[PDB]
Design a protein around this nucleic acid. Structure first.
Lengths: 97, 94, 48, 133, 116, 52, 125
RNA sequence: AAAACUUUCAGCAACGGAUCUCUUGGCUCUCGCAUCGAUGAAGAACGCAGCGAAAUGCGAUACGUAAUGUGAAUUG
RNA sequence: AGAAGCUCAGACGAGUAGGCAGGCGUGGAGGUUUGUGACGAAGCCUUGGGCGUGAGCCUGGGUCGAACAGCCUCUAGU
RNA sequence: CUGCCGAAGUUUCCGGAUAGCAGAAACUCAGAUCAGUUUUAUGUGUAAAAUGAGAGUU
RNA sequence: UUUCAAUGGCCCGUCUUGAAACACGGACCAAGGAGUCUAGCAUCUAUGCGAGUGUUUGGGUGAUGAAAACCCAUCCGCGAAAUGGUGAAUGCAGGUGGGAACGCCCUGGCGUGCACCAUCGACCGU
RNA sequence: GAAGCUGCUUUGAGUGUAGACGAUCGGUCUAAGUUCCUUGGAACAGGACGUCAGAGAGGGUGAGAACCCCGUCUUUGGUCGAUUGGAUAUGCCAUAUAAAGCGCUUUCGAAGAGUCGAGUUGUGCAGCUCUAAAUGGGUGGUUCAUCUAAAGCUAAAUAUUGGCGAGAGACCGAUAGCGAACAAGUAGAGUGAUCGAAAGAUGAAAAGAACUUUGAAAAGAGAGUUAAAUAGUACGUGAAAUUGCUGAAAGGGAAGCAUUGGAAAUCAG
């Protein structure tokens, strides 16, 4: 406001390829909370599917540890260490065209 | 302000006033008689269409709808016939 | 929760009651409301 | 800074409460808390629930029942999945952090509740947030 | 030259009135036509599905509608778009087939002379 | 209760809105100070306005 | 409160309309209330005044004076009444004008036109 | 060294039109609408009233005629 | 105990450029004062009185004849 | 309108960056370091008692 | 308040200079009269939320003024990953020292040790 | 797409009437104090007692009016006429020996030239010179993809300092706001193109000062009107500069100012 301006007090003083990246530690966070309660920590024959393309991510990177629960990761691209950690956690990677 | 506008400001002839500026007025229904009878003039067209059992748009709506109360593979599909749709409103049945 | 008694057309207390909504326990902020009101009471200003 | 620029009435109430506690006790904890309440938001960075979980069970761990105290916001850390039991007193909790701590863990506290529980700061871990920003 | 938006509320109400004036003219029928479902043309957007312009001549023919009566009952036609995959064809056939099942078509008045 | 919700229950008429949480639990610090917990640990209360 | 967007609540436009109204409108502007006996007789709250109407001055210095209407001076909103005049310095009589709202009609000048107007405004003749 | 004269102060009277109060005006924003002319337009000139110069209205049918509405004025 | 407050003690006081803080006044807006007013609002005048370090404020009398202000916030053609 | 703080007055490098003087913010420091000062000692310079002051940095 | 006496008192503003003086401005009074609005960027402070955040292009809706308030579908902006295609806990997401704060003791000792700073260390900046 | 074939599905460029639903124009309809007292020239003020309210917007009325008047609300309508729009029902007429969609093919399928383009000179476009093609030509991409120029029409969303109206505003308040609130592009200036002002307020009502007297007259003095002429058209309020008069005081080639008191005047406690 003009009233609080300090010129009110000077009166009188003479004056590429689109590819957002997601790391492994956030892969389970993308999935909703009720599915995590169902699939995470339980040895179920059916595994959850995390299509990281539908969540606005182009590539899955390898930062972080995944929990030992297997999970199917559907994506376009994946860093070489990321899918190493994925099968070490028991999951598989399905590259999406 | 203009010489044209000052011309009639000083003139004795009254202005050609038409009182047509009634906002908030929703257009009345001609066309279908059944719709006209069951249509109430206060509600919007989206509220009237929903109440009468009709669709204002067959597509998605490009905004958040209103909420007044806290609500509680070719062959099998290319040749399949949808078993019509039920009429839930008496107007739609009408 | 506390209950509030409902009053009839003649001012007599009705036997029905309602639990106090949680909104009545919200923090009461003169500083925040004044700032929001300052900006919101500016949104129907015609230009000059 | 003899007073905070914040016009929040409840922040002024906390400052009043810890003005008394700082001067009517001999706790260097209470003097520290009063100073950090005066500090601006720039100098009060948020601390994550994961860093709190780390600093409790770090090295020799020995967290026991010690209550974590931070003058700031305890933001949640969605990367960590299984949340330990924690007791934190803070200015604010993000809705995620408060929900996660309560569901699988201990309790959340405000700075007035802590002053009742541990007026002298006994068995309290005074944790700051990373200012590297 | 500065453009101002003081008529932003005035424009919003004028369009809501225009929608209301449409419904006055044509009451038992929707104020919008049925658009198809298509997939955007880029690697960034091909996962999504948005509304196209009209249903291709093969989508109409497969559904059972002819390209002449399609406009009459409110089904836009797109002579330019084509079906490069069965996925797009089967998706829009069911969009029409749902439309036809949910549609009430009032009969017209047919002129008929005394003799044939 | 549906318009505003609570601090732990979502508002039904406002998608993803929870009531704000306060900085303090009890908004009366006077009784907080005069509580037994704090009074039992404070050092000896010095004098008020003193003689010159 | 006004709710129509066709009626103006502007003081500027109300004074301009009142002070620039033509004689056909100033006739309706200068109305006077009917007396108690006339109101219970005609079921009419108020009428526009007319020459040769027996009225009774209600307010002003001339309160209580009674007389007919000699000329409704529509162009300055003043009513002129017989035996209600002001004596100038030179002895001439200048009639004193009173606003129509300050008088009360005690005997109407009934014509065919007024009678239809009475029964037009929900009244009994 | 008394008056005059000059100056200062106060009172009254002048001169002046500030201040205050308002205001059929301006300015700004929004809204609805689309209608000049060879069937002579916009503009110009001259005229017309019982008593008129401007403005307004009008065109030798000249501060208007017909029709329609109102219902008893106009007014110096 | 308007803790924004109350109280005790000591020292210091020019100040350009510059830096920092608190105040006075004006037009209009939201709130408020069971606010003032034809038994005289505003304005103006006065060798009338009072308050403040100061910007300024209140008041007596006279004149005047229709509106005006205090506090809390907003705003600026201040 | 009042109150408080308060300079430089010019080096050093290419109109300037720098430093210096003045402030702010955030740190650690009181069994500590400073100093437009004087002594003592070693050969004017260097090093360690007197006196004063809380002293530092970013 | 006016006046007298004693004592004191050089015309204000601007400009130039180390400094004056000069050099302009000023007959008198009233009213008007000059760091404003906006776009971007950056600092600091406050506020809301916080790995998120941003309702107001637009749609819904709004009977009491409806240019307000209210509600939000899909996108999008910045942030969450850097480096020059690839793309990150080796090691409690690493040890040593100083350190805020706390605890146990009989000033000091011991333990714990945030922020930050020097240190050995890694991983593709973390 | 044409032409054949096939067999299912189709049909008015009419003309009346009736009623309903809309739009436009005009006329018309509308709740409650003007009871008492006090102040005042005037009550619309204060007080007392009431009323209406889907109306307590605003304006007028002799000072602040929901109840005196116009209005406002009801009206997101009643009524009366008009003039019209797209439907519905129904009557009459219908040139059907007709027209169309879909489906089938041992039959066919025309597609725009001084234009594209090349060269050059100017600012994709234009001039100049030269001047085409028919799975051709245009435009993209690493052979492919896409399009079909050199002919044409087309509502809506969009713009709008003008034109016909309207409703508003944290706008200006007569040196402001448009140059112009009045008189305004006027008075006035210039050969001309053009340039371009100043100027709002008596009172509720003109009741605008009869009459007498002086004076040639303008005017003056008594008088009179008004609540008021400290409202007399040189008109609300009447500031400062400046000027005249009266009172008090001071003054030997400046003056204003400051400090301390006296004297005179005038206040306060």
């Amino acid at each position: 406001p003009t009233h609080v301006s300090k010129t009110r007090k000077l009166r009188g003083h003479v004056s590429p390829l689109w590819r957002p990246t997601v790391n492994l530690d956030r892969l389970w966070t993308l999935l909703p909370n009720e599915a995590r309660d169902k699939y995470l920590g339980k040895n179920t024959e059916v595994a959850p599917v995390i299509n990281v393309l539908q969540s606005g991510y182009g590539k899955v990177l390898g930062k972080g540890r995944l929990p030992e629960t297997p999970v199917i990761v559907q994506t376009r691209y994946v860093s070489r260490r990321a899918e190493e950690k994925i099968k070490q956690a028991g999951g598989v990677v399905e590259l999406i065209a | 302000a203009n010489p044209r506008q000052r011309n009639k400001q000083r003139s004795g002839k009254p202005r050609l006033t038409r009182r047509n500026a009634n906002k908030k007025a929703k257009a009345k229904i001609y066309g279908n008689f059944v719709i006209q009878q069951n249509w109430d003039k206060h509600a919007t067209l989206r509220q009237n269409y929903a109440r009468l059992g009709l669709l204002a748009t067959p597509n998605y709506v490009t905004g958040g709808v209103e909420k007044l109360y806290p609500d509680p593979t070719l062959d099998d599909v290319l040749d399949k016939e949808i078993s019509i749709a039920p009429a839930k409103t008496e107007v739609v049945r009408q | 929760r506390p209950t509030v008694s409902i009053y009839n057309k003649d001012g007599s207390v009705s036997s029905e009651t309602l639990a106090l909504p949680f909104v009545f326990k919200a923090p009461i902020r003169p500083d925040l409301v004044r700032s929001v009101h300052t900006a919101v009471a500016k949104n129907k200003r015609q230009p000059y | 800074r003899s007073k905070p620029a914040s016009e929040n009435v409840y922040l002024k109430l906390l400052v009043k409460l810890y003005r008394f506690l700082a001067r009517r006790t001999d706790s260097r904890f209470n003097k520290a808390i009063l100073k950090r309440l005066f500090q601006s938001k720039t100098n009060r960075p948020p601390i994550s629930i994961s860093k709190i979980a780390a600093l409790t069970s770090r090295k020799s761990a020995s967290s026991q029942n010690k209550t974590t105290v931070v003058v700031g916001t305890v933001t949640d850390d969605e990367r960590m999945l299984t949340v330990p039991k924690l007791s934190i007193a803070a200015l604010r909790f993000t809705k995620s952090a408060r929900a996660r701590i309560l569901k699988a863990g201990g309790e959340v506290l405000t700075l007035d509740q802590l002053a009742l529980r541990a007026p002298t700061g006994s068995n309290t871990v005074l944790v700051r947030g990373k200012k590297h920003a | 030259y500065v453009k101002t938006w003081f008529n932003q509320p005035g424009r919003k109400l004028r369009r809501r009135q225009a929608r209301q004036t449409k419904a006055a003219k044509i009451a038992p029928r929707p104020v919008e036509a049925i658009r198809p479902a298509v997939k955007p043309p880029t690697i960034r957007y091909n996962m999504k599905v948005r509304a196209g312009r009209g249903f291709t001549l093969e989508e109409l023919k497969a559904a059972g509608v002819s390209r002449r009566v399609a406009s009459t009952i409110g089904i836009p036609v797109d002579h330019r778009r084509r079906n490069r995959s069965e996925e797009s064809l089967q998706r829009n056939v069911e969009r029409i087939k749902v439309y036809l099942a949910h549609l009430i078509v009032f009969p017209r008045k047919a002129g008929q002379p005394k003799k044939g | 209760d549906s318009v505003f919700g609570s601090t732990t229950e979502v508002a039904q008429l406002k998608k993803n809105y929870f009531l704000p949480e306060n900085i303090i639990s009890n908004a009366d610090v006077t009784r907080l100070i005069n509580s037994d917990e704090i009074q039992s640990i404070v050092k000896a209360a010095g004098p008020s306005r003193v003689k010159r | 409160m006004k709710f129509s967007r066709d009626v103006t609540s502007s003081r500027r436009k109300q004074r301009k309309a009142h002070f620039g109204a033509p004689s056909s409108v100033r006739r309706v502007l200068m109305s006077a209330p009917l007396s108690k006996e006339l109101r219970e007789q005609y079921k009419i709250r108020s009428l526009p005044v007319r020459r040769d109407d027996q009225i009774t001055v209600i307010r002003g210095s001339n309160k209580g004076r009674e007389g007919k209407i000699t000329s409704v001076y529509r162009k300055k909103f003043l009513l002129l009444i017989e035996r209600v005049t002001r004596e100038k310095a030179n002895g001439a009589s200048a009639p004193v004008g009173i606003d129509a709202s300050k008088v009360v009609i005690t005997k109407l000048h009934l014509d065919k036109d007024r009678k239809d107007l009475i029964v037009r405004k929900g009244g009994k003749v």
